[PDB]
Write a protein that binds this ligand. Structure first.
Ligand code: NA
Ligand code: NA
Lengths: 713, 713
């Protein structure tokens, strides 16, 4: 059947905003995963997982009698899709069980690993999510093999449909770089937001860049992709060498023996794929990657044998039975065990990407330190494994269960505990009046609270107004945040705060994070008053102020809004149309299409635009909360045309006289063009909609202010 | 960005079941359009519509000073997408304002028509939907031009995103037949469920079949497509001749002057399209279809001039100024007015498809009767226009406002009024006990009630258990309904009914429609008891029994289930895979994916399969309500393979011994294969889910039993 996407392939897709409806979710509307998990007997689950590790199933026999390496790979891949650029991917929604990830070539045979876990998932039911189980199983694998993990948190709720992620524009799995949809340009610059070198890979190609087996060049791709997953050189080396202490790769015959990935397989395969015609198709005859390497002399036990071998041998370029490039130790004895035949031994082998850890000069220094000091290696790997598997969980308030690490880590963007009484409703009313009496305007108050709260993204639950990091580097200097204007507002609010806090007894105080939010609430109430409407905007106290020393400035860079349609802002000139960037932002804010439409039309008339731009300010009563954006945009008495200076800026002129009435950008005018967004704009632009517009604006403003409030969940 | 649909283009799409979530809808979840409409000042709206008729806007000037013809075409096209095969399309959801229908070539310039209505829509807001406004406007246009309509009902709630409809597989707008994706095969056989001859047309091609100007062959296409829109020969002739009494076509210059359709146009177009470079691009210069025909001497007034012209001249083939085929009256004088210049007159003209009404011998006889008896033509056209514009509205209980016709029409599948006391809870308990004492089994009771209720489709709100039409022709004879089994159940039920009704006082009686549904509820209660669960299934009385004379047997044929996955039934071997047909059926029943999952898994173990087929009966306790279907389908101890006899039946064998344990169809096994359906099956097959399964099944059963109960809404 031909679809709208077929006819109009470039038209904007609003379906990304309407996933996760209560329709698609089999659990009741009142289901609370955290409540279920908190009563899980986690120790019993781990005892079951420990038993599974050495209980081989004949349909996918265990290498060395132990599934631990397979499960570590499973958990690593679940987490390894994460990109810092947008926060998308990662292990936090259990997306490896859905398309496309369930069928990426790098996930081959993890379908078998997940099937091995069905009996335990079935036993525990709703009290452990697939998402949590996949990570837990990797931790139990590590523990079972002698490695002390840093800890584990539950709380990843399951999802029920595929996430909408841009994974690249190639139409061929694993396509080498430089094709018509190349993800590389310039001097090997990978396009943002991508974090893998080839479509369907987790990070890098194990044979080397585009298949060229050069460890020094491979190291470049490792460093770039791991940095795009938030890992530095020490963490990178720890992870790779730590992982490759365990298990083996699978390449026993040619890859042409392997059939369809799971999403392409026949119905009889019952959700599995990569069925192999090579010999028994499994076990000793398995084919996964096509490589055939076993890294250590004890693949089922933690050791420091990976670095002993990497540094203790010289390496020769060789081919696996499937034809893939890999390396074997020159002159070595057969010291590596075979996975099924106790009478066979093999020489040490390595991937090109393993040899990167020795031939790249900066990695070599770390690797040598880890070789000489294996305790340092173990601690770095434990810490990096925790970070990897938790990076997208969000604030520490979301962490559940008895094994949560007590150490607070800088990468968690930590928020101090609150140790004093909070303001009550009468205090909040007193503070809103003080804020309005200061002379701060509706535009100032709205713009500041919007800047603080709108850094949130639901993909990895980073950002938001909690912390008051807007006052700190780097947020206080972002161009979108209007740094001189911001400084002036924050000075005024900090004086209000000092005066209120100095007058209290009993230790009650207000944080600056809460006062920034409350001040924005006062601005919205005042704008409603300016329109003739008395409303109260909800406010929940309890945010705390983080320090500069508790803030990693480099990690915060990815949260800079370079396109924020809600403030009519674009930092530079981009390939992707601005309207598509607005819908991307709305999805990170967790907004529906109706919510995005109300919010933007309100912000326009409140004065939230960066630079006091008049684009989209379709009112003669700025700083009053009215529906004038929608009534004016939809007025057929105005004709619109792109300007000669800039095709992305439009003039609205009276159709009869030619008089200039307005200007707007693509972000403004999409609401009068897109057939679905225009239908929404019509509801809010109708003669009966003033009350509705106000109510719905207040509700979506309060939603945005609370996005990071997992302390109240 | 490459998507899952790109990678796996034949995989099943479950998003069709989760449209219309509260997420995409701007109105609150409690908004009730019927309540809003019932307080609209309908008379005020009609005065405004009357004013609009002759208020010409310079950006799309009115032909003859009166927009009535444009508006009639607008309303006709809103209704004209309807297909009796699935009930999809039609005016009832206002879908002409969304993709793709807003941009079909046959809807060209109806963007202008709908934009002319924005000020009225704005003024009345949520109290009149777009869907009702488009029909009301057509009615007012007719009234304004001197034609008395049969009536009007409101109640078409607006929708907020495109409907998922199969419109064909062609990849080229208007493609002629016989291409790679041809909708025709054999002797001009149109593929079900389509009801138009070319992609982007409403019914037929005005130049003739595939552009060949043969009125006799055109007639064949008109008859077939109108029958597929529920119209017979008399209704067809009345509608075409009635419509073409008014207005004109637009073809003033070559079609190459017309630019992008609305969904392709630039942002500055603000939702309009087909901008024309020909002269002024509008009014006298308009280009819509490419034809240049004006049918009557008074295009803005009801007349009997259509048939006077059709019969009063002989016709010559000619070309419009765009090159399209049309007909002109031989030796006529210039009697037809010009739309803009009072000094120009034109000869009478006709389309090929108008000439069909004279040169097809069965239409000729109707046309002549209408020409000789214009009162008959007027009444037929009024009735047909009502039917056209109301066909998809469902039972008369949904009809709102002060202009609803009192006459009950056969096509409405009428249900008699209930005029007696209904059974109460103590009566329902007595009847359930009598049903269970009769010896009717769980399988018989479930299967019968399922057969009665599951004819409902939400697309046109036809079908369901109200009316007890299961006892009448043709439902009692459908193969899916197991006619001999059904007769025996009905005989037993009608004897229960007779005995209960004979024992009452005060006029109380139970209908057979109610008893069929109540008996099914007793079967579900009994099956829960058989599993050790105490369950009460809700029941709402008030259904009535319709007569055979209230049941048009030909119109009922389209409701016959030729695929019903819920009963593991397929009537024949089809091109579309059976799991796609199950999702299609789920969508007509208004079910979400979780609801479809629970329902199907329960029905399998209750014995609802046609012919007592063992396919998908994955239990050793048939007729007990358990989650066995899920637990056994997901057991990895079983391996599945298609049979040699039939690739569409699968055998599930013990993996270790080879022994046969079960058989299933594609409909059974998709729940273990599709990655989203299997995630749902996992929830219900977990060890904690037996109670959840029973409660969820009861809810979805009740849902299906009440789909047609608009008497309770
Ligand atoms: Na994420
Ligand atoms: Na319909």
């Amino acid at each position: 059947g031909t679809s709208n996407r077929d006819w109009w392939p470039n038209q904007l897709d609003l379906s990304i905003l309407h996933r996760h409806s209560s329709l698609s979710d089999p659990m009741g509307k009142d289901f609370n995963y955290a409540q279920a998990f908190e009563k899980l007997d986690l120790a019993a689950v781990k005892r079951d997982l420990h038993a599974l590790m050495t209980t081989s199933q004949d349909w996918w026999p265990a290498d060395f009698g132990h599934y631990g390496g397979l499960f570590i790979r499973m958990a690593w891949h679940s987490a390894g899709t994460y990109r810092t650029a947008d926060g998308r991917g990662g292990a936090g929604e259990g997306q490896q069980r859905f398309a496309p990830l369930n069928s990426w070539p790098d996930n081959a045979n993890l379908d078998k690993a997940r099937r091995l876990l069905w009996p335990i998932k079935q036993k525990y039911g709703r009290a452990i999510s697939w998402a949590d189980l996949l990570i837990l199983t990797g931790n139990v694998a590590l523990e079972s093999m002698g490695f002390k993990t840093f800890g584990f948190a539950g709380g990843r709720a399951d999802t029920w449909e595929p996430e909408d992620v841009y994974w690249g524009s190639e139409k061929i799995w694993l396509e080498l770089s430089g094709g018509p949809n190349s993800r590389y340009s310039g001097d090997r610059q990978l396009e943002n937001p991508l974090a893998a070198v080839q479509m369907g890979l987790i990070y890098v190609n194990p044979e080397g860049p585009d298949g060229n087996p050069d460890p020094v060049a491979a190291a470049r791709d490792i460093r770039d992709t791991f940095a795009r997953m938030a890992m530095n050189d020490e963490e990178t080396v720890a992870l790779i060498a730590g992982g490759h202490t365990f298990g083996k790769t699978h390449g026993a015959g040619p890859a042409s023996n392997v059939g369809a990935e799971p999403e392409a397989a026949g119905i009889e395969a019952q959700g599995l794929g990569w069925k192999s015609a090579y010999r028994t198709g499994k076990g000793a005859d398995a084919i996964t990657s096509g490589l055939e390497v076993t890294w250590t002399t004890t693949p089922t036990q933690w050791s420091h044998n990976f670095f002993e071998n990497l540094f203790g041998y010289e390496w020769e370029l060789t081919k696996s039975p499937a034809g893939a490039h890999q390396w074997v130790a020159k002159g070595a004895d057969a010291v590596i065990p075979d996975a099924f035949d106790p009478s066979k031994k093999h020489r040490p082998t390595m991937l090109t990407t393993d040899l990167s850890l020795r031939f790249d000069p900066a990695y070599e220094k770390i690797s040598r330190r880890f070789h000489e000091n294996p305790e340092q290696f173990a601690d770095a790997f434990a810490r990096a494994w925790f970070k990897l598997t938790h990076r997208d969980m969000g604030p520490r308030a979301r962490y559940l269960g008895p094994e949560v690490p007590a150490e607070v880590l800088l990468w968690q963007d930590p928020i101090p505990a609150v140790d004093h009484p909070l303001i009550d409703a009468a205090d909040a009313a007193e503070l809103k009046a003080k804020v309005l009496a200061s002379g701060l305007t509706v535009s100032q108050l709205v713009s500041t609270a919007w800047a603080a709260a709108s850094t949130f993204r639901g993909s990895d639950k980073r950002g938001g107004a909690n912390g008051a990091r807007i006052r700190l580097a780097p947020q206080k200097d972002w161009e979108a945040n209007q740094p001189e204007q911001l400084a002036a507002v924050l000075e005024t609010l900090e004086a209000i705060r000092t005066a209120f806090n100095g007058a209290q007894r009993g230790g009650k105080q207000v944080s600056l994070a809460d006062l920034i939010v409350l001040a924005g609430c006062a601005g919205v109430e005042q704008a409603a008053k300016n329109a003739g409407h008395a409303v109260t905007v909800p406010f929940a106290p309890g945010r705390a102020d983080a320090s500069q020393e508790q803030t990693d400035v480099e990690s915060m860079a990815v949260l800079e809004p370079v396109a924020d349609g809600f403030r009519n802002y674009l930092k530079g000139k981009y390939r992707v149309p601005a309207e598509v960037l607005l819908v991307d932002k709305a999805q990170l804010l967790t907004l529906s299409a109706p919510e995005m439409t109300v919010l933007l039309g309100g912000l326009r008339v409140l004065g939230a635009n960066v630079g006091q731009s008049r684009h989209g300010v379709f009112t003669a009563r700025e700083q009053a909360l009215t529906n004038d954006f929608f009534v004016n945009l939809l007025d057929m008495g105005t004709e619109w045309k792109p300007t000669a200076a800039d095709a992305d800026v439009f003039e609205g002129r009276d159709r009869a006289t030619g008089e200039l009435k307005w200007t707007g950008t693509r972000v403004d005018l999409v609401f009068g063009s897109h057939s679905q967004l225009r239908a929404l704009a019509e509801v809010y632009g109708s003669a009966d909609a003033q009350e509705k517009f106000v109510r719905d604006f207040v509700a979506v403003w309060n939603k945005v202010m609370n996005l990071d409030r997992f302390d109240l969940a």
